């Protein structure tokens, strides 16, 4: 039980993360499960001393969309909370900003939401 | 007050009437000078704001269809009016495009606009 582990969304992405005792999140985000060319570094932070009443654990991470093979000149940040129980979940909202000129900056940022679970989709 | 002609940081024009019933009605022009870039807007505002110095909450929508163009999208601005010597409307906005299910994850852009009554 805990944030450390392998997580999946319902749109074919996965990530592996370690939640360090110091509040660090480190890992790899894979945009398309089973496609090693879609693996990128992830780094973030989480609350290492959360509330005990059933409240989630606040966290956030960033992936810059550059790896050894591909560069999309953009970065996504996911902000959310980890919730335990029988089927643990990470519920997030995200911002995906691309490098643009000042004239195109008004349309530089996408927003969305994703929920992750440790259960691999069938 | 809120009724009037407003300009954002990019030069777009927002002509609005704030009704006694909480309604916002008007037009939004994405580029100065042409009727082709003018769209209907409708929204709502708090008609009885707090009297402690807080702003007046408001929001409105523009669907990007007019008699000339259709971008199959709509933007909602959510924000507050701040009165004073240089009155301002500070907003954040969401622009959602109609997409197929495959592309729904990237259907929405987010941004922020500040409006004043000063013509650029």
């Amino acid at each position: 039980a805990g944030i450390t582990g392998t997580w999946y969304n319902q749109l074919g992405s996965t990530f592996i993360v370690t939640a360090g005792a110091d509040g660090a999140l480190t890992g790899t985000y894979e945009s398309a499960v089973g496609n090693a060319e879609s693996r990128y570094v992830l780094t973030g932070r989480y609350d290492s001393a959360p509330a005990t009443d059933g409240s989630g654990t606040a966290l956030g991470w960033t992936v810059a969309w550059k790896n050894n093979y591909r560069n999309a000149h953009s970065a996504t940040t996911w902000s959310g909370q980890y919730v335990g129980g029988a089927e643990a979940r990470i519920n997030t909202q995200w911002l995906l900003t691309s490098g643009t000129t000042e004239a195109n900056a008004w349309k530089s940022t996408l927003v969305g939401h994703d929920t992750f679970t440790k259960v691999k989709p069938s | 007050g809120i009724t009037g002609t407003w300009y954002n940081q990019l030069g777009s024009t927002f002509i609005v009437t704030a009704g006694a019933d909480g309604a916002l009605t008007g037009t939004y022009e994405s580029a100065v000078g042409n009727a082709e870039s003018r769209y209907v807007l409708t929204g709502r505002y708090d008609s009885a704001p707090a009297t402690d110095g807080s702003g007046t909450a408001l929001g409105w929508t523009v669907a990007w269809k007019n008699n000339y163009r259709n971008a199959h999208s709509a933007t909602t601005w959510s924000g507050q009016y701040v009165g004073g010597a240089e009155a301002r409307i500070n907003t954040q906005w969401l622009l959602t495009s109609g997409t197929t299910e495959a592309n729904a994850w990237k259907s929405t852009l987010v941004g922020h606009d500040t409006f004043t009554k000063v013509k650029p």
Binding site: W106, K107 | S12, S30, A71, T75, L95, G111
Partner: peptide, 5 residues
């Protein structure tokens, strides 16, 4: 917001 939006 700009152009057609």
């Amino acid at each position: 917001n700009q152009x057609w939006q």
